Design an enzyme around this catalytic site. Structure first.
Site, PDB file in Angstrom:
ATOM      1  N   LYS A  62       0.868  -1.156   0.000  1.00  0.00           N
ATOM      2  CA  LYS A  62       0.000   0.000   0.000  1.00  0.00           C
ATOM      3  C   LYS A  62       0.918   1.223   0.000  1.00  0.00           C
ATOM      4  CG  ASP A 110       9.666  -6.829  13.188  1.00  0.00           C
ATOM      5  OD1 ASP A 110       9.784  -7.049  14.411  1.00  0.00           O
ATOM      6  OD2 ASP A 110       9.222  -7.672  12.382  1.00  0.00           O
ATOM      7  CD  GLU A 123      19.842 -11.121   5.182  1.00  0.00           C
ATOM      8  OE1 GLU A 123      19.144 -10.794   6.163  1.00  0.00           O
ATOM      9  OE2 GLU A 123      20.743 -11.967   5.276  1.00  0.00           O
ATOM     10  CE1 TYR A 124      14.736 -11.398  -3.264  1.00  0.00           C
ATOM     11  CE2 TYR A 124      16.251 -13.227  -3.520  1.00  0.00           C
ATOM     12  CZ  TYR A 124      15.011 -12.667  -3.720  1.00  0.00           C
ATOM     13  OH  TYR A 124      14.034 -13.395  -4.347  1.00  0.00           O
ATOM     14  CB  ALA A 125      14.772 -13.339   2.641  1.00  0.00           C
ATOM     15  CG  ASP A 173       5.412  -6.686  13.106  1.00  0.00           C
ATOM     16  OD1 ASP A 173       4.318  -7.280  13.384  1.00  0.00           O
ATOM     17  OD2 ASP A 173       5.592  -5.970  12.066  1.00  0.00           O
ATOM     18  CE  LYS A 214      10.209  -3.707   3.287  1.00  0.00           C
ATOM     19  NZ  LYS A 214      10.131  -4.367   4.620  1.00  0.00           N
ATOM     20  CD  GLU A 235       1.122 -13.107   9.133  1.00  0.00           C
ATOM     21  OE1 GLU A 235      -0.070 -13.465   9.216  1.00  0.00           O
ATOM     22  OE2 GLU A 235       1.965 -13.340  10.032  1.00  0.00           O
ATOM     23  CG  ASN A 236       5.535  -8.835  10.130  1.00  0.00           C
ATOM     24  OD1 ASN A 236       5.368  -8.069   9.172  1.00  0.00           O
ATOM     25  ND2 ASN A 236       4.592  -9.054  11.038  1.00  0.00           N
TER      26      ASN A 236
HETATM   27  N1  LIG Z   1      14.379  -9.158   1.474  1.00  0.00           N
HETATM   28  C1  LIG Z   1      13.356  -9.874   1.017  1.00  0.00           C
HETATM   29  N2  LIG Z   1      13.567 -11.164   0.681  1.00  0.00           N
HETATM   30  C2  LIG Z   1      12.545 -11.878   0.199  1.00  0.00           C
HETATM   31  N3  LIG Z   1      11.291 -11.508  -0.018  1.00  0.00           N
HETATM   32  C3  LIG Z   1      11.113 -10.221   0.332  1.00  0.00           C
HETATM   33  C4  LIG Z   1      12.066  -9.362   0.850  1.00  0.00           C
HETATM   34  N4  LIG Z   1      11.521  -8.114   1.103  1.00  0.00           N
HETATM   35  C5  LIG Z   1      10.271  -8.234   0.726  1.00  0.00           C
HETATM   36  N5  LIG Z   1       9.957  -9.479   0.231  1.00  0.00           N
HETATM   37  C6  LIG Z   1       8.675  -9.929  -0.329  1.00  0.00           C
HETATM   38  O1  LIG Z   1       7.938  -8.784  -0.728  1.00  0.00           O
HETATM   39  C7  LIG Z   1       6.607  -8.837  -0.155  1.00  0.00           C
HETATM   40  C8  LIG Z   1       6.127  -7.434   0.157  1.00  0.00           C
HETATM   41  O2  LIG Z   1       6.914  -6.854   1.197  1.00  0.00           O
HETATM   42  C9  LIG Z   1       6.730  -9.766   1.040  1.00  0.00           C
HETATM   43  O3  LIG Z   1       5.465 -10.365   1.329  1.00  0.00           O
HETATM   44  C10 LIG Z   1       7.777 -10.782   0.577  1.00  0.00           C
HETATM   45  O4  LIG Z   1       7.230 -11.863  -0.156  1.00  0.00           O
END
Ligand SMILES: Nc1ncnc2c1ncn2[C@@H]1O[C@H](CO)[C@@H](O)[C@H]1O
EC number: 2.7.11.1
Length: 251
Positions: A16, A147, A84-86, A129, A35, A133-134
């Site tokens: 949003k 968070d 950082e990329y997850a 948090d 982000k 989800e987080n």
């Molecule tokens: N660093 C990250 N690594 C992996 N997925 C992410 C990351 N940041 C955001 N996301 C994804 O983007 C969506 C919106 O924030 C999250 O629900 C998640 O799936």
């Protein structure tokens, strides 16, 4: 930095407030995640104040199981978060795919998380948090907490009595928030999930929760030891890590 300093990739998710497309610094050819949060949105809700804070906090928060926040910048209209990329996505998802986690995965997760919280408490920062989800997943199915701002009573489901009751709360909450989780892990759903927001404090504050015909009893107690009305009656960090359940199925 500058928005031109990176190559943008597909949208990892939605928001949003702002977005967050796959990124890549043009120098390092290194993969990222940006982000980006809008203005008008950070403005349409006294949150400019809510920013900077976490910003400066994660902006130091150096821990494996804590999604790092390399850097941040911001142009006229928007702002950006370099993080950082997850890759493995969200535990929520992982949790909605396999129904419920086993015992290695859930106990282990909990201990990962715990320590992330330890290093947190130590450096005096009480998160608040945490829930599927987080919480994100790295290369090795490892955990990462994130968070920040963004976009089924789930709203309450997770909060601890001391708060929904508007009362005063401190560090001792991360333990409660740690109970629920471990529970929803071994179950598939939170321990206080119920139809109405009302029919919930009733179960949360009253602490009304039951076990399914199977959860190990070593959980049944590690958990009952993680959720209790009295915030001071709950185990401090160590204990779980040192609980007869964490150890064994774990790592
Ligand atoms: N660093 C990250 N690594 C992996 N997925 C992410 C990351 N940041 C955001 N996301 C994804 O983007 C969506 C919106 O924030 C999250 O629900 C998640 O799936």
């Amino acid at each position: 930095w500058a928005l031109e300093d990176f190559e943008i990739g597909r949208p990892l998710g939605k928001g949003k407030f702002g977005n967050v497309y796959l990124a890549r610094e043009k120098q390092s050819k290194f993969i990222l995640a940006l982000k980006v949060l809008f203005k008008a949105q950070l403005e349409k809700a006294g949150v400019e104040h809510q920013l900077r804070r976490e910003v400066e906090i994660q902006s130091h928060l150096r821990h494996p199981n804590i999604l790092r926040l390399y850097g941040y910048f911001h142009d006229a209209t928007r702002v950006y978060l370099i993080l950082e990329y997850a890759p493995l996505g969200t535990v929520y998802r992982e949790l909605q795919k396999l129904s419920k986690f086993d015992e290695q995965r859930t106990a282990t997760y909990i201990t990962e998380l715990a320590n992330a919280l330890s290093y947190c408490h130590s450096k005096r920062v009480i998160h608040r948090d945490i829930k599927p989800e987080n919480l994100l997943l790295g290369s090795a199915g490892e955990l990462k907490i994130a968070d920040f701002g963004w976009s089924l009573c789930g709203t309450l489901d997770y909060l601890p009595p001391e708060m929904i009751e508007g009362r005063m709360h401190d560090e001792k909450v991360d333990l409660w928030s740690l109970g629920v989780l471990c529970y929803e892990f071994l179950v598939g759903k939170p321990p206080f999930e119920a139809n109405t927001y009302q029919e919930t404090y009733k179960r949360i504050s009253r602490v009304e929760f039951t076990f399914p015909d199977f959860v190990t009893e070593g959980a049944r107690d590690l958990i009952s030891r993680l959720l209790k009305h009295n915030p001071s009656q709950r185990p401090m960090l160590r204990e779980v890590l040192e609980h007869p359940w964490i150890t064994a199925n774990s790592s």
